[PDB]
Design an enzyme around this catalytic site. Structure first.
Site, PDB file in Angstrom:
ATOM      1  N   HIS A  41      42.222  33.780  35.599  1.00 16.55           N
ATOM      2  CA  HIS A  41      41.509  32.673  36.306  1.00 16.55           C
ATOM      3  C   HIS A  41      42.398  31.413  36.443  1.00 16.55           C
ATOM      4  O   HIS A  41      42.208  30.630  37.374  1.00 16.55           O
ATOM      5  CB  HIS A  41      40.140  32.273  35.687  1.00 16.55           C
ATOM      6  CG  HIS A  41      39.068  33.321  35.602  1.00 16.55           C
ATOM      7  ND1 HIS A  41      38.675  34.060  36.711  1.00 16.55           N
ATOM      8  CD2 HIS A  41      38.243  33.630  34.565  1.00 16.55           C
ATOM      9  CE1 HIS A  41      37.650  34.801  36.316  1.00 16.55           C
ATOM     10  NE2 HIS A  41      37.354  34.582  35.032  1.00 16.55           N
ATOM     11  N   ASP A  89      40.635  39.610  32.349  1.00 19.84           N
ATOM     12  CA  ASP A  89      41.150  38.257  32.610  1.00 19.84           C
ATOM     13  C   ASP A  89      42.552  38.023  32.014  1.00 19.84           C
ATOM     14  O   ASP A  89      42.769  37.142  31.170  1.00 19.84           O
ATOM     15  CB  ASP A  89      40.122  37.213  32.141  1.00 19.84           C
ATOM     16  CG  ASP A  89      40.379  35.802  32.580  1.00 19.84           C
ATOM     17  OD1 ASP A  89      41.079  35.612  33.591  1.00 19.84           O
ATOM     18  OD2 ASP A  89      39.813  34.880  31.953  1.00 19.84           O
ATOM     19  N   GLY A 184      43.759  31.127  28.336  1.00 23.28           N
ATOM     20  CA  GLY A 184      45.031  31.843  28.441  1.00 23.28           C
ATOM     21  C   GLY A 184      45.912  31.808  27.213  1.00 23.28           C
ATOM     22  O   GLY A 184      46.934  32.490  27.178  1.00 23.28           O
TER      23      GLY A 184
END
Ligand SMILES: NC(=O)c1cc2c(NC(=O)[C@@]34C[C@@H]5C[C@@H](C[C@@](N)(C5)C3)C4)cccc2[nH]1
Length: 228
Positions: A41, A89, A184
């Site tokens: 994302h 993700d 992340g």
């Protein structure tokens, strides 16, 4: 990071700051000499903007001998990742050249055995994400030690209501949590990378909405394929 403390400078040499047009955007983890793992994302709507990776940093603004900003040759989001989901993700960033390694820059060994981290295991999460509800951004790396939350508790209707698949894991979020801009980043358990902070917007520091982290062991074959 909410409810954390300033990290010891350069004590996490794997820590990366994934940046867009010179501003910290997401956390990241150096997993090989030329590869940084992050969340998919992060790269959404970045298309055009200059993506870079800052290695060997503690302060985002001050000069440090180990600090180096790397250009990115390729950005590889997981093929099954989607804007409106928390699944798959993951994002792999290939640096313009292999990173210069040293005491403040080193890849972190990552989990390849696909077995769950035991509930209660104390894991480390670091980042340059917001530190309070107002959105204050720290200049220097922050961290917090979080106990892993068992998937079944995490999947209760009161919590994440069945959204936690076997490829995902949870950690407690009682005042101590990852927040906006920590996305992340790495979840490290016993000196080994176990998870990547999901980059879906989530309330921070609320015990009823635990931290969600993508399990790297579940994507071992994909990470290997990309690096090859
Ligand atoms: N993981 C968490 O704890 C957490 C994340 C988060 C958040 N949103 C992000 O941090 C990003 C992550 C990437 C890059 C940027 C745009 C975006 N759409 C994709 C969303 C910021 C907002 C509010 C609380 C939050 N909490």
């Amino acid at each position: 990071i909410l409810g954390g403390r300033e990290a010891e400078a350069h004590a996490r040499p794997y820590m990366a700051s994934v940046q867009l047009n010179g501003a910290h955007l997401c956390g990241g983890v150096l997993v090989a000499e030329q590869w940084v793992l992050s969340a998919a994302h992060c790269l959404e709507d970045a298309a055009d903007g200059k993506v870079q990776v800052l290695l060997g940093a503690h302060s985002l603004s001050q000069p440090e001998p180990s600090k180096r900003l790397y250009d990115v040759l390729r950005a590889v989001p997981h093929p099954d990742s989607q804007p409106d989901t928390i699944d798959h993700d993951l994002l792999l960033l290939q640096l313009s050249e292999k990173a210069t390694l040293g005491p403040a820059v080193r890849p972190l060994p990552w989990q390849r055995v696909d077995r769950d981290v035991a509930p209660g295991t104390l894991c480390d999460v670091a980042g340059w994400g917001i530190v309070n509800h107002a959105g204050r951004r720290p200049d220097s790396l922050q961290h917090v030690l979080l106990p892993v939350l068992d998937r079944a508790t995490c999947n209760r209707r009161t919590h994440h209501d069945g959204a936690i698949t076997e490829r995902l894991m949870c950690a407690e979020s009682n005042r101590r949590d990852s927040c906006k801009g920590d996305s992340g980043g790495p979840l490290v358990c016993g000196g080994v990378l176990e998870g990547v902070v999901t980059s879906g917007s989530r309330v921070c520091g609320n015990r009823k909405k635990p931290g969600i982290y993508t399990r790297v062991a579940s994507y071992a074959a994909w990470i290997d394929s990309v690096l090859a």
